[PDB]
Amino acid sequence: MKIAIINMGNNVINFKTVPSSETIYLFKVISEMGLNVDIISLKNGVYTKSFDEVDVNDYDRLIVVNSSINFFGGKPNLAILSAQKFMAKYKSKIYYLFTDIRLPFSQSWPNVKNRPWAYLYTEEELLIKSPIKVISQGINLDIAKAAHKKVDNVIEFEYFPIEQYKIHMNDFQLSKPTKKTLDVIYGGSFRSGQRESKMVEFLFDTGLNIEFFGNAREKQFKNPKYPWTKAPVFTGKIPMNMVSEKNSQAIAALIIGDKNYNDNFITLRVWETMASDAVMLIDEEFDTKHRIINDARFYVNNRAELIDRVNELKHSDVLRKEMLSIQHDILNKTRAKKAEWQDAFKKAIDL
Ligand SMILES: O=c1ccn([C@@H]2O[C@H](COP(=O)(O)OP(=O)(O)O)[C@@H](O)[C@H]2O)c(=O)[nH]1
Numbered sequence: 001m002k003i004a005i006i007n008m009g010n011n012v013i014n015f016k017t018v019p020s021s022e023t024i025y026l027f028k029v030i031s032e033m034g035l036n037v038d039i040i041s042l043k044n045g046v047y048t049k050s051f052d053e054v055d056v057n058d059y060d061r062l063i064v065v066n067s068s069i070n071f072f073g074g075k076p077n078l079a080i081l082s083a084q085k086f087m088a089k090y091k092s093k094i095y096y097l098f099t100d101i102r103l104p105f106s107q108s109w110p111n112v113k114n115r116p117w118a119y120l121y122t123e124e125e126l127l128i129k130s131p132i133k134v135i136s137q138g139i140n141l142d143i144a145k146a147a148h149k150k151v152d153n154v155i156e157f158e159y160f161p162i163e164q165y166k167i168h169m170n171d172f173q174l175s176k177p178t179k180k181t182l183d184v185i186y187g188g189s190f191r192s193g194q195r196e197s198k199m200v201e202f203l204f205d206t207g208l209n210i211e212f213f214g215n216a217r218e219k220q221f222k223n224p225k226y227p228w229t230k231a232p233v234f235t236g237k238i239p240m241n242m243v244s245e246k247n248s249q250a251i252a253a254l255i256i257g258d259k260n261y262n263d264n265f266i267t268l269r270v271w272e273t274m275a276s277d278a279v280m281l282i283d284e285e286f287d288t289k290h291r292i293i294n295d296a297r298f299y300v301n302n303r304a305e306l307i308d309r310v311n312e313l314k315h316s317d318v319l320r321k322e323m324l325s326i327q328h329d330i331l332n333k334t335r336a337k338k339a340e341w342q343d344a345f346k347k348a349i350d351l
Pocket residue numbers: 018187188189190191213214215236237238239240241243256257258267268269272
């Protein structure tokens with residue numbers, strides 16, 4: 001049993017970039033459950049083998065981490081093109097890890113055939129014809145199927161909480177008590193405005209000391225539907241492996257998602273936040289049944305409640321420590337089910 005894992009649209013080298021980090025974490029968690037796996041990328045490296053130096057059909061299972069396949073100006077993006085050429089040569093089922101609703105599997109040929117450099121490729125070379133199984137992070141498979149209605153060879157769908165991988169790593173460690181410098185914190189990108197309403201609601205005009213780290217910038221928030229006056233402080237992005245430590249700088253950390261994530265996706269940030277020294281505050285809409293933690297104090301319905309909850313935490317250090325103890329306890333209860341999680345992953349990839 002030989003497994004190959006690749007990122008469909010981002011080069012993989014080390015932990016200096018997020019897509020690379022995620023692919024390496026998955027390679028590691030899969031290796032940690034006793035499986036033989038190789039990461040195949042553009043060139044040979046510490047964690048990778050080159051597409052040009054291996055035969056894709058020498059692998060019994062091909063796993064693909066979701067990515068965008070959009071092309072912009074300039075030279076051909078080989079991270080996308082070489083990955084799809086590799087996939088096109090595979091003669092068995094492909095397992096697509098679908099962790100972001102906006103990144104469904106899609107054929108690149110349609111987006112290539114019109115480009116000025118289109119002559120460098122052929123349909124036969126890029127057209128992926130193998131059957132594809134989508135492993136969905138979201139429990140609602142209808143939302144996953146709708147995202148793939150344009151691709152004909154995607155014939156199987158199965159739910160699996162892929163992003164729990166961060167808490168199951170052999171070197172996992174809870175964040176320790178940290179000197180606080182912020183009231184509320186949130187790390188992420190602008191996600192093309194797919195979550196602007198919630199970001200403005202909970203992070204803008206709160207009167208609190210809030211920081212928004214990641215690729216997002218203040219000037220991106222200009223949707224007339226969601227006006228604001230005072231924005232949180234925006235700082236640059238940090239390595240993925242430093243996220244929980246960053247969250248720990250604040251008294252509380254926010255959990256929000258895209259509309260289609262509500263009561264559907266339990267994202268990586270849930271785990272990065274739960275494991276941090278920051279109290280996890282969740283948008284009520286994101287988890288209406290309180291399945292993450294059965295304690296209403298961890299949920300906020302709107303800006304007003306977030307402000308009240310944060311001030312209650314600032315006022316009582318005991319309340320803060322108590323809630324932190326509760327969320328760390330719940331996190332460990334899930335880590336205690338690692339065996340079941342590993343077995344479910346193996347089943348998802350037909351092992
Ligand atoms: O500076 C940053 C900000 C974010 N992240 C990662 O990006 C994720 C959030 O991605 P996104 O903004 O797409 O939000 P999501 O839809 O995952 O909630 C976080 O959980 C981290 O893993 C990171 O590594 N560095």
